[PDB]
Amino acid sequence: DSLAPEDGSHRPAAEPTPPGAQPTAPGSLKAPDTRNEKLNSLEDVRKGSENYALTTNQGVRIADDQNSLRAGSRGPTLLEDFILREKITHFDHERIPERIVHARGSAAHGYFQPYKSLSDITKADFLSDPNKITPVFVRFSTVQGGAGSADTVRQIRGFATKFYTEEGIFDLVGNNTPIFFIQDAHKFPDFVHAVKPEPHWAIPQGQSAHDTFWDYVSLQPETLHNVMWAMSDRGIPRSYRTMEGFGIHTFRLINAEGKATFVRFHWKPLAGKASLVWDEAQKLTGRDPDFHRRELWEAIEAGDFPEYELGFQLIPEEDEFKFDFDLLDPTKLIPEELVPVQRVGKMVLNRNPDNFFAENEQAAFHPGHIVPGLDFTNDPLLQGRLFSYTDTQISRLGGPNFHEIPINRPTCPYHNFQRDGMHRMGIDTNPANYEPNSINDNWPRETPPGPKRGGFESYQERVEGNKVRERSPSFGEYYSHPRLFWLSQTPFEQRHIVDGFSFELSKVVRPYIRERVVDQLAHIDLTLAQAVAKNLGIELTDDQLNITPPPDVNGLKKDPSLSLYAIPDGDVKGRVVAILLNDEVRSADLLAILKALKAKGVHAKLLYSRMGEVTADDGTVLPIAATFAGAPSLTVDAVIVPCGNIADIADNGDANYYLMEAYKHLKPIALAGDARKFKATIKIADQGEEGIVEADSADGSFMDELLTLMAAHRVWSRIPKIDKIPA
Amino acid sequence: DSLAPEDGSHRPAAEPTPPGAQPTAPGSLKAPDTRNEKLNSLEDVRKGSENYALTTNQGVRIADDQNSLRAGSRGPTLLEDFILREKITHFDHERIPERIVHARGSAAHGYFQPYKSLSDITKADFLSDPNKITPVFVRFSTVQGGAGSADTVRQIRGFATKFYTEEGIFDLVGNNTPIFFIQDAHKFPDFVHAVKPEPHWAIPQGQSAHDTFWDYVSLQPETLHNVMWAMSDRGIPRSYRTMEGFGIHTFRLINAEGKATFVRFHWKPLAGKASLVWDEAQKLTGRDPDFHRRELWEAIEAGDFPEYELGFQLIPEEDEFKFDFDLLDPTKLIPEELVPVQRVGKMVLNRNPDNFFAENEQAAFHPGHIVPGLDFTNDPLLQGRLFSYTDTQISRLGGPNFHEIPINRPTCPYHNFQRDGMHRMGIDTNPANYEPNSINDNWPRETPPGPKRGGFESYQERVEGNKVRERSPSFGEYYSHPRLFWLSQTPFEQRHIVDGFSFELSKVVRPYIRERVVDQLAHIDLTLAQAVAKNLGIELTDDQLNITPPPDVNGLKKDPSLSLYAIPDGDVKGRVVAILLNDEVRSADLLAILKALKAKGVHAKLLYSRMGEVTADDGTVLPIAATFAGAPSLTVDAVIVPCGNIADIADNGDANYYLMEAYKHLKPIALAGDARKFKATIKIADQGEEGIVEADSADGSFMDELLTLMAAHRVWSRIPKIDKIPA
Ligand code: HEM
């Protein structure tokens, strides 16, 4: 019974389509021709459904999946109903522990390839040949919230990449800021407990605006640098496609000759850097808590594949101690003005998973999963991470055989003497389960280290010191990097940082904690400190006003690569505009609008006061994607109002509020013909305002203007005009 | 180190205080003198902290909890650091699986007492004497979202109560609507999978506005009754304190003479019935996703204990077949006009937990946990529940000894021959682990059924029929209960139902699903169907326009007890009002305002454009609780603006928007003296309007008028006026 619509509209077309054009679908059904070695290797466990009989897990066909077995139709359920019990038992045991941190995340499949061979600095196989492609699986995430929390919270974001190389799995488990909050892994449980929901009542969920977080920060000044990044607009990215990625720690690259080079890993977003504004981000956690997850999935379904460039900061071994900060301190960044990022390769995410639980939820990343050609360093945060990931996956994934869960399996050979464990899939035929053995002629065998396909050998770093629980004295500087970050931001970025601290500390109930945090800000920069204090009704003391600013970082008074917006990097492909329809749209305006958006790869969403269709002035039937309230301005990058019967929507509260919200949030707005009467609602300018595109009709020049604004992301010059608007 | 402020302001006073006045805290520290038998029995496992040395879990004192052990202060971390490894190991394994459904929930401790002995209808010990107090632990929840999802989503809410009786634990596991979506437990996994996030991409999180839910609903008309309740304002309660509770199924009461009486369980909120409006609820999931958890905790800390009256609908065994519907069908309600609710007792929730994870997350409720004096029925949804909760707790709580986790332990004696299992706490000394035995003289021993303290014996219900997987023909009626619900709602409640369906179906991407749901609505009520269709741009066919409405339910064409608001039951105690300050408030207005609110137990929050303090006209220093943006109008019940230097905030966008938002969401607003200048912000006429209180000062009847409006909850007559308003 209950069947598909006659017309076949239940099923999405298996071709690239813009967001909202078709229902989303499992990756293998949406893009069956998109393949890679890892995607193909998962074919053994993919399960179809069309034309198959419904069965139990033991393969018994079910005749009635609507009713339990009972003694009479109004009688008691019987214990012998094994079909009911198997179905309910499986349902009852669907959940597994969420990740302790980074539980909220969104993932996709893709591939990587180097631009040229890097064999002179590393023997890693995946970086040895420009035409050797390596499948990847990437998961982006937030830190604090649970798996069911919201996407556009203010938080550091995780950026984890699993490379399925020919010499083993390499996991590059990074975040979207170049430093971490703490120096030693021993404090991780303390820091995480402080940022997570407070233990008595389990509030608040995915935001750091609460007493315990700011108490920890105020008592542990090493956290200030990453706190500065979190309070900036870096903490509220527009998309996972428009943020940077960093490995944070200094690692080593080892070449065939045995030479070690220190390296820091970077990902550069080829769509550019872009973030939301706080009010927008917070409201969007309510209007669409799945915004980043959705946006990633739809970009891949549209062909707007997330693309990132891998880059390396390289420091010779002999230059380990030449900076004014320790290279092994994860609260310190290496300014690009001192050590440039060398481009290494490109990563493209081009296919969504088939099943979120099987592939995203069960994926296991670990920074200890390195390969020959790579090695660790003594960074005390990284050292502790090496223990933790393996340990947590034993309980999260139910045993030691988590590498046999399909998404986690290597695509290269794996053979050893490990056996058994819960849910053991591999059936070993080796007569031996130990080495050395004579009974299988000692196979599988050890392999000496070498230039290629060699066994792993650690770099023989010299270790000299007593067994101590002590922080290196070189790590005891906490204010210069925060200050370098502060001075590198534009004026509007600085304002947003001030507003971030002010908002968060206004939610701290104990006033002395707010004062202690302001005291720490006074050791970074007095202008920043005074601006936050003023918003909290706090007065800096005379001593606070006389704190000497921290020294410059190796002579730098600023580094523009630390700003999101100082150096233009805008890219409109993949962005989306809202088009507010009316019941008699001028089709000539629409035609020109859609053509210009199409030429730059910008999507459109047609909105109205109701769902269904509206008919343009030439008879074209226009399906409505959503209502004005249903897809708020928060979800788009710009708003366009075509001419037609403007009287239809001129007095619509939601239509007017749509423009007020977009205006407040600094988005470009374009008004054609009679749509220019909406200028009154955003109560500003009569001769026009930079940021507002207006003309008698939507034409080539009107669209060029709008698209130029869109490439600059937001209208920062409108900032002074928005705090009067009631929106 | 000694980091607390010397003034002791880090610690909350151990006395009842209003929301926001002090930092919240663990229940036993906030209210040490609030006790009950269960709370006292948990003293064996409560752990303090003050004045104790920091140790490992083995009791070894720790000297340096800031650093890992390494070879040299910049060297590698050593494997012999057992302190680091224990600390990180425990952190790595903190999470357990969340509940499969109702994962998001908030709980508190309390007590229950019957008004009079019910010995004539039940032998249940907890209902046998008015002076018998039974400790309870209650958990309120949503259904779909994860543990980290938001509170004010549109969903059915769970209302689960664990009664720690002298004859065993009784768990009454109910919801906030009197029926469930489905009829047979065999479809529970299907219904739940349809409402939960879609499997390819895991979206959307806590809202049912997506294709698979409405696909299922459109193909299974049995769901329409509970869907009607979810689309009404019942799906968005103001607080867990202001919603009703129901057991849903017909159970049995058994008295000492062996007579069975059918019973349906009800909880009546002594604070009244109250819900939010959709736009407010959805925006509140972003501004404060923990609103209901917070509100419950703060109500209890303030002394505004959540109070509920337990009531029974009783039906004699001989009247089983006297209704138009089957008593065993969980998609059908029993109209109070046909069978009144008899008041049974009162439950008061008066203490929060100490540790959310230990007490709330690990609590295990199960409808199969009944006691002598109660029994089950053949309702086919209830029958399947009896299997599922035991099964799911084995994996959720790590084994069969979950009854030994402190919160789940009975307060009465428990002795049997069950042994071992993971995490076994009890050390059995019985020589025997089986019965019958002679080696311990057969103890513990079976106990015959009797009037008091007897063994459990099932009611000897006659069973007759063949073994079949078949729905009773008596359950095959799906539209009369939905229609009865619809006709019992006020006109504004009907509009909100129409708006709920309209918004939800507008998020369904496949248009045919929207059409099929509209067709089902046409079988319930033509006005409802036409209004939803209009909002979707769908036209009803002539056939749909002629579908004959379903019959009345036992001659009823409405039952006012199904409405939230048809019969006023307003209670102002525990509500909160925002007070928008200026930099020279008229102290006289503020004195009058705050004392009037205090006299009725209404809380206040003093808001401004920054934190700190403001000084009134007479020099009174006024502490600011939050900024206008920090504590939006969504979080309060009414807004008051006192006179003073109104020019200070008159052009503040946030202050004006605060009133626009409150106005749109139908909240009472009161403006004193020059604060009447804000009338132009919300377009109020010079002569005024119902729902807006205004006078020259806050004296006289100004506060009485505002409190009268608060008692009516919202200003329903303003609906037509908010239609426009750009907010
Ligand atoms: C530079 C500092 C760090 C970065 C960049 C980082 C990054 C991440 C990321 C991106 C994830 C999520 C991976 C996924 O998507 O599944 C994650 C998970 C995790 N992190 Fe780290 N983290 C850092 C520090 C630490 C430390 C110091 C510890 C403990 C010593 C730690 C313990 C964990 C654990 C236990 C998980 C859960 C993994 C799982 O369940 O599979 N992290 N981290």
Ligand code: HEM
């Ligand atoms: C009248 C219909 C139902 C009502 C009123 C109801 C109510 C609830 C409530 C309030 C909870 C949360 C208890 C807590 O706070 O921990 C819950 C959890 C649960 N429900 Fe039910 N439910 C119903 C139907 C069902 C059915 C038909 C099944 C399966 C056959 C089911 C399976 C579960 C499971 C497995 C849990 C999680 C329990 C745990 O993990 O401890 N429910 N339900």
